[PDB]
Amino acid sequence: TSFAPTVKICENLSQMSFAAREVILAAIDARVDKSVPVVLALSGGSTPKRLYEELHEKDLALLQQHAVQFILGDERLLSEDDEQSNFSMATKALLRDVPSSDVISIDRRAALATSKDEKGGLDGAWAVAQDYEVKLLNCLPCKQINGTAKSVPVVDIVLLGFGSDGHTASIFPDSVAATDEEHVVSVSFPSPTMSPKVWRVTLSKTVIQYAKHVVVLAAGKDKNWVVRGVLSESPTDPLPVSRFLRDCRGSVTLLLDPGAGEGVCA
Secondary structure (H helix, E strand, C coil), X not given: CCCCCEEEECCCHHHHHHHHHHHHHHHHHCCCCCCCCEEEEECCCHHHHHHHHHHHHHHHHHHHCCCEEEEXXXXXXXXXXXXXXXXXXXXXXXXXXXXXXXXXXXXXXXXXXXXXXXXXXHHHHHHHHHHHHHHHHHHXXXXXXXXXXXXXXXXXXXXXXXXXXXXXXXXXXCCCHHHCCCCXXXXXXXXXXXXXXXXXXXXXXXXXXXXXXXXXXXXXHHHHHHHHHHHCCCCCCCCCHHHHHHHCCCEEEEEECCCCCXXXXX
């Protein structure tokens, strides 16, 4: 009830992708030291594919001038050529024309041999998450987590989606990421209804909750219970794992289609 998200029910995906682009563009414009990039964490799926197409068409010049530093918010532990990886999706849509120096990459090889084994991929998943954590703590601006000897990267904008299972990023119900307040990058295996059935690495709840701006893009009736569960002032059931966004310290914007947004607005 000190949590005041911006909520915009969008008529079509184009309105959704445009609203998202304006947050990005405004953060880039608002910088005082233009020598430092806006850190942007990317999401996967058809939802953001379009936003990324729109930035490629409209804003490459800024991107080629290093205005932004790109990270993957979550990833499938699949080869990076594999079409089911978020890096592939994002590379086709936009990153193919962004300086490689502006994108932080995730090395998945420790995982590829075991990442589709639900039980056995755990160790390899941690191995990739640990590597990626080190890269983010080296390359991004960081702050100390109060009460610890540990630090967290401050992401300017985190882009997210909702799953019909209540998840965001790869923080799934009943996974380690769902209760991990230790790490910067955690791991998970998808929930029963979610695909692809491969191990994941994800930014933790902590990282998301210290981001300056969190923008969720969600469409579909099947997400409306997630939207409601997140937005209700007091806990309501079914309660979705992404209610943790309530404790974000930055701004939160939910960009919803009329199905996902049903009942929310007057």
